[PDB]
Design a protein around this ligand. Sequence first.
Ligand SMILES: Nc1ncnc2c1ncn2[C@@H]1O[C@H](COP(=O)(O)OP(=O)(O)NP(=O)(O)O)[C@@H](O)[C@H]1O
Ligand SMILES: Nc1ncnc2c1ncn2[C@@H]1O[C@H](COP(=O)(O)OP(=O)(O)NP(=O)(O)O)[C@@H](O)[C@H]1O
Ligand SMILES: Nc1ncnc2c1ncn2[C@@H]1O[C@H](COP(=O)(O)O)[C@@H](O)[C@H]1O
Lengths: 407, 412
Amino acid sequence: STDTTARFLWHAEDGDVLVIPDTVDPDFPGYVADTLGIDGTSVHVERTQTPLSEAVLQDPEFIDRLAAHTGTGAGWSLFPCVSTRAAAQLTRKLNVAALDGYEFAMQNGIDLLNMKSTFRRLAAGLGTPLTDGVVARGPAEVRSAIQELIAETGMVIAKQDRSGGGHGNIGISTSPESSFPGTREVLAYANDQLDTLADTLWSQLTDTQNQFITVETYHRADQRFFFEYHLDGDRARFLHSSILKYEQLPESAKWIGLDSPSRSEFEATLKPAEEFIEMIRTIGYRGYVNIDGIVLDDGRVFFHEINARWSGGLIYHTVAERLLGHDYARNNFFSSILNVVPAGLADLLRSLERAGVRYDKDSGEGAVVLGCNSDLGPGAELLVFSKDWDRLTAMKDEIATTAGTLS
Amino acid sequence: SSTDTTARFLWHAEDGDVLVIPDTVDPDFPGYVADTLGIDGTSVHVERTQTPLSEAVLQDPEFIDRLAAHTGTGAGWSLFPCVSTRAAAQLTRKLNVAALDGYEFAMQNGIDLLNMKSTFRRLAAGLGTPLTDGVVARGPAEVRSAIQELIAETGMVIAKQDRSGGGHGNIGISTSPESSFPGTREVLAYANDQLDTLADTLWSQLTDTQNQFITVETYHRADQRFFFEYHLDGDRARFLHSSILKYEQLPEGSGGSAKWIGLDSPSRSEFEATLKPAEEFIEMIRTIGYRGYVNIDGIVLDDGRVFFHEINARWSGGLIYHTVAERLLGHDYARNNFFSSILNVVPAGLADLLRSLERAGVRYDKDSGEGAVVLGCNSDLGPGAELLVFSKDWDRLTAMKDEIATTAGTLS
Ligand SMILES: Nc1ncnc2c1ncn2[C@@H]1O[C@H](COP(=O)(O)OP(=O)(O)NP(=O)(O)O)[C@@H](O)[C@H]1O
Ligand SMILES: Nc1ncnc2c1ncn2[C@@H]1O[C@H](COP(=O)(O)OP(=O)(O)NP(=O)(O)O)[C@@H](O)[C@H]1O
Ligand SMILES: Nc1ncnc2c1ncn2[C@@H]1O[C@H](COP(=O)(O)O)[C@@H](O)[C@H]1O
């Protein structure tokens, strides 16, 4: 059915392999490879019918599947989303390019990072800015932390320690007309019931491996942004910045898309995030990492986490650079729609044509398909380009009109 | 009415200080220390708590008030905590005492993220710090394949609790009895046909709710078992001392574990391959932001290889040794001096213990800066009473030691 993984096909060059647990719209590779201007027939897709997990990566059936392509391993490398211990061993076993930071990974190092607990710890000691927070160690400590952090704003967040996308986050409100981007539920504050309120907070966001909870002052932000980086033994190249776009608030806020150069890239954001990033470079992580953060109306800057993995808009950025150019951000803007009424790639391309906004190499304007049927923003996932923000906004509203969204 | 293991830290005391102990001090022991030290004894007080120094007590309103009574308005005062927990940092605030350096780091129990064995394997492996082959084991099957792969090189694997200390969480695995395992509690023979339950025996006993990691490593025989202690501030990571870790000598018996019995300081393990890597590792943890005392353990191989085992963001053991050394012989004491502790003297009343040294001819002579001093009269630090011996000469100091063992007996 779904093709939420097909999107990573845009990372592809001649000779490459993609691995998906999903399906591909039969047309989606040729289309992607025609757009990317590469030899479709020189590009492979190896499907599993079960999720892409550690067990798979260790599984030699799985392993020899890849060894068919890599054969000797010479001139082959692995391009993992999460530089896991199995992923390193997979480079070991295939005789493939050694993973960078191999040893950090072999000690499951990339899993200390990708904890919200580790983040605050690291950012307190370093001085990187943080909302007032507590790394909760149990329901008792969860109860106190809300009794204090509720007061500045009337708003508080509770994050499961290992999690992504805003999925392990519950908010705490003193006002039903407060909206919480990056939460799942939102529960109302209640002085007379907080022992019970931290209970439901404990049981829902802790398990056997995760016994730390974070609880922060939630702040209403004027800019919800993040920065994605690439790391090696020499440097951390700043890759890009984007905007976490939310909605579901009419008078809780679900994620809906990403937007191109963030309107948030000054020193007070770049410099503290860059310093933190390098310290992580120092402790060993080799690869892509991104740092979430906000900017407030008054001006205070805050950071939430690093995820040592593909930001999830890395694909957006790759696409832009492969279509528009290394420096694309200077004169271009991209933006992403989800919940587009899904359909065949053919039926998708026609509405984009019927709307007048299909990607068009001449202008550098228009939209491309990253999935006809995905779960991430359940719908078809599009990416749209424009030298002009206002044009981009019209083009999207057309794709609404012509192709159809779901509410 | 029991152990005085806490009483050793009276030797940090200066004028007007307060030491907090859950313990029992020989009622003569304070005055002996201040005396030997030269402090105004009636200035230093000792506040006995009837419970361990738990986070709840640091937060106990009566405990803090009883601390306020001495701290006054905080002005002049600082906290001198072994472990900069969160409750520690919060104490300095409600007593108006000077802020704990690294406050925010502490406020996030950073200290606790450090101090995990798994953490150390991770950071060092990322940094480059020499490690022994090993694995952060997420479960018992992992433990199985680790013991299976890691047993060969030396025939000895070690297995440790993620958050523990004093060699209490380390379980040895041996393919031969006649294995000496410094830094472990028990040693188990590795059979092939019982590597199954081996692995789940270790898993079940070295984990709990809050710990789902077990460290598994190649255990090496070693020319020297050392560590280096540092002090940390915003400006500099500060080298304090190096020290030799002394473990029990087993009569080549089918027992494996060698208990820890003492500490020799001006160590013979300070060169390029131990210092500089350790240096690099310690600076980064200053980058991440720990503030205070920390130490890094390590071994040097018969063939000259080096490996580091862990850091502890807290007082090492030998910090009181080093301290007292500084206070009695001076800052740059390691140039011309040596010291060595003892853990297993027959415990005794202070007067008697002081008789023995005199009888042995080695009670610390202020005039010559030579001889021994009591650190506790009945401590459970390993064995029993703890003493610390000084000399400008290595052989003389040893000769003083067995004099003491002859004179005051030992619990071996
Ligand atoms: N776990 C511990 N065991 C024993 N003593 C401890 C422990 N943790 C802290 N202490 C003692 O607690 C005291 C902390 O010092 P504190 O109570 O703040 O006043 P002070 O520093 O001694 N006096 P001053 O700094 O000169 O004004 C020191 O005596 C430490 O030795
Ligand atoms: N893999 C190993 N190979 C060889 N010797 C080891 C190994 N691991 C530990 N040791 C030795 O055993 C001791 C055990 O201490 P360690 O492994 O650092 O944990 P620990 O008990 O927490 N140390 P500490 O808290 O300072 O008492 C070390 O000081 C070394 O002497
Ligand atoms: N833990 C994971 N989370 C998300 N995607 C994953 C994960 N593991 C594997 N994948 C998929 O497998 C590829 C990268 O593998 P990995 O490095 O294990 O994330 C991408 O196609 C991902 O969609």
